[model samples]
Target: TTNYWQDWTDGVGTVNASNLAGGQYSVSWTNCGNFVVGKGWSTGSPSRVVNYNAGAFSPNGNGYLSLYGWTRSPLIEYYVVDDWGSYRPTGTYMGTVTSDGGTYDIYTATRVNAPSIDGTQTFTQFWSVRQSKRSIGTNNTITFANHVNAWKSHGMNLGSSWAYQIIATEGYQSSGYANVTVW
Candidate 1:
């Protein structure tokens, strides 16, 4: 299949080894893919795994990934993870670990055609962000910015609390924001 890119708002988007494979992923609806993910599944489970189990798909390599989606309940969130919200989408640049051994990590990606209307005429897309045990610890946060109008339309206080969030790994305990789930 051909790589159909940018189906939502464009800027910065991120994805882990899991959803990075396929599907419509996101809160801002900035990402949606139709191309075959071509890559090998790795054994880095419980850490930050990005691969397939049996056969890899075609047209799969690695580039600026993104997602676009919506949920039935207004309390639903869209993101990737490992367990208990401990692990996150590791920033492997061109298949290389870029930010390593850091207390707080800042990840950036593009959201193409986000918060867009589907053919069925449902689910509103919105911009979003992710975290991987950064300054705020495993207590991740996905801020959906630049959508005041959309949020208001959905009866959501966009800037106030309209962010598409992923509340995993419990809450932030300390101030330093260290990785408490590490071995």
Candidate 2:
């Protein structure tokens, strides 16, 4: 079965998320504090590649279009950011890797006692922010193995127990709108 969800924390704003069809979702927010909404799986794997097409992505403030997911045991949150607003290229720069026909700056962050899928705890966040933003047209892209391997090559290993994954739209204090289709 296909699994997807919308999650947020510490937000004082409005958000609208819905399923457009099988493996497709659309989301819009007005001054939202934070949110992640899209489609993926309950059990994610780096072997899986997600294909998505986005239309009219307008982030009024700080936000991004990304592949958001989590893992257990090690408890990690990872992001493969494809597009973003102004507040991007943020975090501790680990290094850089070239993948998916682009260059991504690797970053790692520690969330000290922050909210998480399991509970409130301190966890590490791995980020791959593309140096050049990209738009998707269902090119069957987002080859997960490439980024995962790139991270592991730099010692950013992921757990085997994959939780939820998504081709999601994220907001960090923003009014934004996006329609996405995942295949």
Candidate 3:
């Protein structure tokens, strides 16, 4: 797929791509990884909610699958559930949690060159750091509700309104493959 992106839903079916370039790319899933998805859009207030399911992912080498999105209203709010493949995090650590299907070290930081639907802005990134490879399995289920809830329990501001959600994968200096079969 090179540097391209697509969007699909359950009724619409699934979509797959490989040898993807390293950058901001959007994809979605449903039915416990039974469906594939691409970029989604909306023009309403920020809902700040997401529902995630199970799926399988394999990188050609080292890469990252960041579950990220944004909202607007009171202001532009950004959030991300970062599955740090081989890329580690840096900065003052916020806290940690052992929920949302797995264990994670939470951190609050700013993305230097973050991409935004409303243009480039200072994104308040909520990093759900997973110091391991991402793979789908009986015990490897990534739930948006649980992750968001965990952050809320810590004192993060993801906005009160809903806007849009994007499941983005960015490779480092390598390529990767992913097939999200479960939602």
Best by lDDT: 2
lDDT of 1 by residue, 52-132 (tens): 122211111222221222343432222222221222344322111212222222232333443322333333223222333
Tens digits of lDDT, candidate 2, 78-173: 999988987784689888878778789999999999988877999989999999878655454688888898899889999878888888888888
Maximum-TM-score candidate: 2
Model 3: lDDT to the true structure? 0.47
**TM-score comparison, 1 vs 2, better candidate:** 2
TM-score (all chains, Cα) for each model: 0.19, 0.92, 0.58
Query: Which pairs in model 2 have colliding backbones?
Result: none
Runs of candidate 1 with Cα error greater than 4 angstroms are 1-64, 67-69, 74-119, 129-183
- Candidate order (TM-score): 2, 3, 1
lDDT head-to-head 2 vs 3, winner: 2
Q: What are the candidates' C-alpha RMSDs? A: 16.4, 1.9, 9.4
lDDT-wise, the better of 1 and 3 is 3
Models ranked on lDDT = 2, 3, 1
Candidate 3 contains a number of clashing pairs equal to: 21
Q: What lDDT tens digits, residue by residue, belong to model 3 across residues 44-82? A: 223333333324444444445555555554334343444
Clashes of 1: 25
